[PDB]
Design a protein around this motif. Sequence first.
Motif: not given
Lengths: 232, 233, 233, 232
Positions: B26-31, B38-42, B19-21, B12-14
């Motif tokens: 994503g790689i999350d460090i302390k946030s 990166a685009k992910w074709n879920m 968050d991208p569209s 879910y792009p917030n």
Amino acid sequence: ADTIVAVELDTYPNTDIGDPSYPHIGIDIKSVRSKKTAKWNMQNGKVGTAHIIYNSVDKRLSAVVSYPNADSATVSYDVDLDNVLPEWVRVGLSASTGLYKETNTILSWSFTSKLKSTNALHFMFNQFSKDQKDLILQGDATTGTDGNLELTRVSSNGSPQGSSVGRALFYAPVHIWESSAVVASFEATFTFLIKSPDSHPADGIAFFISNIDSSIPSGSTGRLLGLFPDAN
Amino acid sequence: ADTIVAVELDTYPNTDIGDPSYPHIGIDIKSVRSKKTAKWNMQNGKVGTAHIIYNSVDKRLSAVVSYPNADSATVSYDVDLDNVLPEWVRVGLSASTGLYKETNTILSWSFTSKLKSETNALHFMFNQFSKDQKDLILQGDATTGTDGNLELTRVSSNGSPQGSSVGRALFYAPVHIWESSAVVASFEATFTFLIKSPDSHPADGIAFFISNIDSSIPSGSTGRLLGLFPDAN
Amino acid sequence: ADTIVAVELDTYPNTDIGDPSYPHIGIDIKSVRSKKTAKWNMQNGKVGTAHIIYNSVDKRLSAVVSYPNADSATVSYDVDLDNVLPEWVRVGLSASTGLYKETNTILSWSFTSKLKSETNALHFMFNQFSKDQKDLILQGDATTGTDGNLELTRVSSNGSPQGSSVGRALFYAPVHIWESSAVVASFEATFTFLIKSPDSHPADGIAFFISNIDSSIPSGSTGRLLGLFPDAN
Amino acid sequence: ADTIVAVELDTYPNTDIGDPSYPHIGIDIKSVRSKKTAKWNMQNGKVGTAHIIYNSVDKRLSAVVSYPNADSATVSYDVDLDNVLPEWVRVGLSASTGLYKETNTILSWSFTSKLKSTNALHFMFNQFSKDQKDLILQGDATTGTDGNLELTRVSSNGSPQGSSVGRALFYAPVHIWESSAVVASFEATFTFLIKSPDSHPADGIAFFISNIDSSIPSGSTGRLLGLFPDAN
DNA sequence: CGCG
DNA sequence: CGCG
DNA sequence: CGCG
DNA sequence: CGCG
Ligand SMILES: *OCCCCCCNc1c(NCCOCCO[C@H]2O[C@H](CO)[C@@H](O)[C@H](O)[C@@H]2O)c(=O)c1=O
Ligand SMILES: *OCCCCCCNc1c(NCCOCCO[C@H]2O[C@H](CO)[C@@H](O)[C@H](O)[C@@H]2O)c(=O)c1=O
Ligand SMILES: *OCCCCCCNc1c(NCCOCCO[C@H]2O[C@H](CO)[C@@H](O)[C@H](O)[C@@H]2O)c(=O)c1=O
Ligand SMILES: *OCCCCCCNc1c(NCCOCCO[C@H]2O[C@H](CO)[C@@H](O)[C@H](O)[C@@H]2O)c(=O)c1=O
Ligand SMILES: [Ca+2]
Ligand SMILES: [Ca+2]
Ligand SMILES: [Ca+2]
Ligand SMILES: [Ca+2]
Ligand SMILES: [Mn+2]
Ligand SMILES: [Mn+2]
Ligand SMILES: [Mn+2]
Ligand SMILES: [Mn+2]
């Protein structure tokens, strides 16, 4: 009480409670009275090696203890551990002293569990740090001295102390048998240094499996090797 | 607060909080505001796989997410985790729902840590999950035993995924992720999952995380916070 | 020719052919003229350790070399080995001497390859070497059984290292290092060594290499060529 | 001849040469006449699993063969393989057909060897490629079809062929016992699919250990399972 | 990501 | 290594 | 890396 | 599944 399955490395013969008249490896089911033993040529001051083995197919708990450039001692015993231990357990090292003393130095400790229904657990310690958060040290057990685990107390000078008992348990509970399991197996390895300036060395080291909440029993120094509350 | 280093699988792009569209790894460090995406074709309803790798030599936290007979999404980020995480940590999986819903089913989870200073090593592999898993700390709505899978967010008796849900699994034993006097330190982490949503708006995502030993689900970390963060700072 | 991807441990600076003015770890792609080097404080007579790592995600071949209670040398280089090496390869250790001499004793050698496309895996660990090692292809002056160690260059009965020597050990089984339809590919390689030289000019070095399955010691690859290369191009 | 230690999965009873009157797992030392067997509920068309086990302490070669949501079959046999096999060996899978036919499809194959004097070898195949350079395919054995290893021939349509025999051996020689060794051990795992449209299925799959230069014997289709030249 |  |  |  |  705690439920205990141990491999004992008895360095002092307590003939009072069934120990043979010599240093022995033994396979202990729920009693310090081993269900099978073997003569073990303990080498005072030499670093030694212990492999313990079990699988659900052979249902045979086996152990080899050995020193470099020397013959080995083997002990085996046929037991369904699914009839002895609970599903979930903790694996540990224990050691004690009494009237007589020895160092109970552990340089290495490795353990692997497998359940093909595959689920797996493996830990290897070659260094031990001062704050070893994935070990539950009980009694006189200490880490950080030369990067080794010292299960019984030893002086600044080096002199091992008597009437001592301490245990290391790996932090995580282990699944050692499953209901619907095709194969279950564990291997356990540790190197050790039992050195005694007194030529009467006591009392010994053991690998043990126990219920998760296991704790050193009241007065289990000496003949009881930190596992048993009585010699029954 | 808890210190969090996570690999997010945001379904879910917030856009509100960076968050991208589109659905992203994503790689999350302390946030929760990822430091790399990166685009992910879920693929709704398909079983997928996540490999996460980091070493002390390359000091680069990398991740691949993929489904059979389909292209991958890769993300990397250069970070000294010796400068971010404490020496001893817990490793875990988290997942959340909010405005919408999705299932956050974990079918498998593998993790390996090595420290050569003569190597110290920890490896666990789960392919089945039992009703009483004592080597796992379940927090929030997380549960085990349903099909032998780990269900991080709630699922109605009817089988439908529930909204405003958050739950986390942590491996029971603390892990030594870095030491001062060590020459090489490394960890690999693998897990398969099934995100399936009857609503064509799927939310919110799954994440692998490393954290302080005593880490716990922040209050109201449902939705865009993925059960890791108390705020979208 | 053979295709060679190697990690060189150059003890003798051949300034003539681009070696820096000091003993170096280097990353060699198809040329003895390394594509990355680093200062290496080689300790004559001390047992040392080499970790070499590469993955398909980071496509970065990295190496750490170190001795107990001493600082490390690290080298990295970004290279798609799918663009350099054939699918199937052999992994090996090489060593040489020339104007001077050194012992090129290998005490240990470990190698692991993984391909997730559901993973295919190969791992070998040598801590002892026997007189008849059938899982090793010894080429040149390489020999096993002396103290249970692998001696890549010749050593006189007297115990002294010999000059103008070259020998290589290759693991018997071919290894699948990359596949087109694979999501993640990785290898780790570890070996301990003892370079000891009575001459205060030590030469020439040890190297981990990957090569075409049928690879063989080039003619006159003694000295600066480290048993890998036929020329210093 | 070749020196052969195998675990047989016999699907057709050759009562002529000592096979029991039913599909059996068996432990074969140097003869197709197993030294111990067990009843095996072969499920035609179901993917099955085989774990084979040996260590130097128990000196007992054991095997479990099993299908999902079903009971298992176990066979064990006490033998010092240091008295049977040479030091260096090759490990392999074999399979055959005769008058009667079955598919001999291998989906998975894993093998691990350990020598604490530690030396180690481990390979795992979950996909098989068209040019599998770390396998020595002998006879009718093929790779690449659905990413599986097909030890006996099977038609484009799917129909398994008769009088077929083929073997896969791992490329590298294995050290399965050392002179000065404290512990030696190996585990071997493979999943398989024996499917036969003919309700008489034959002849079977085997894990084997052999001398390095081992090759399919003359006329070892059928009762001989690609291992033995005669039924002695 | 789709509808206003 | 001491005590019956 | 040390000597001319 | 056929042959004594
Ligand atoms: O200087 C060396 C002399 C050799 C010692 C004697 C060995 N023979 C022997 C004993 N010993 C008597 C048993 O009780 C002795 C006191 O017990 C205390 O000391 C030991 C040492 O740790 C411990 O096991 C006891 O539980 C207690 O703490 C025999 O029974 C036998 O044979
Ligand atoms: O290809 C990319 C798809 C584009 C998606 C567009 C978003 N759809 C959408 C919005 N936009 C605002 C988002 O906030 C409202 C929803 O809030 C709750 O729902 C989600 C579900 O987990 C959660 O992340 C939030 O934190 C909160 O719980 C809508 O309103 C709508 O529909
Ligand atoms: O701190 C760095 C040390 C500096 C070393 C300086 C080199 N010493 C040296 C040279 N210089 C020319 C090198 O080529 C001559 C030697 O040739 C043979 O010896 C080596 C030994 O393996 C080899 O690499 C060559 O390929 C050849 O076999 C000297 O002449 C001298 O001494
Ligand atoms: O349609 C299914 C009918 C069941 C078959 C009969 C089973 N009973 C039986 C046999 N069979 C006779 C043994 O020789 C038969 C021909 O032998 C050839 O075929 C098999 C199949 O691969 C092979 O093992 C032989 O080596 C040979 O190739 C018994 O002995 C028994 O009991
Ligand atoms: Ca005793
Ligand atoms: Ca989001
Ligand atoms: Ca050089
Ligand atoms: Ca048969
Ligand atoms: Mn005893
Ligand atoms: Mn996100
Ligand atoms: Mn160089
Ligand atoms: Mn048979």
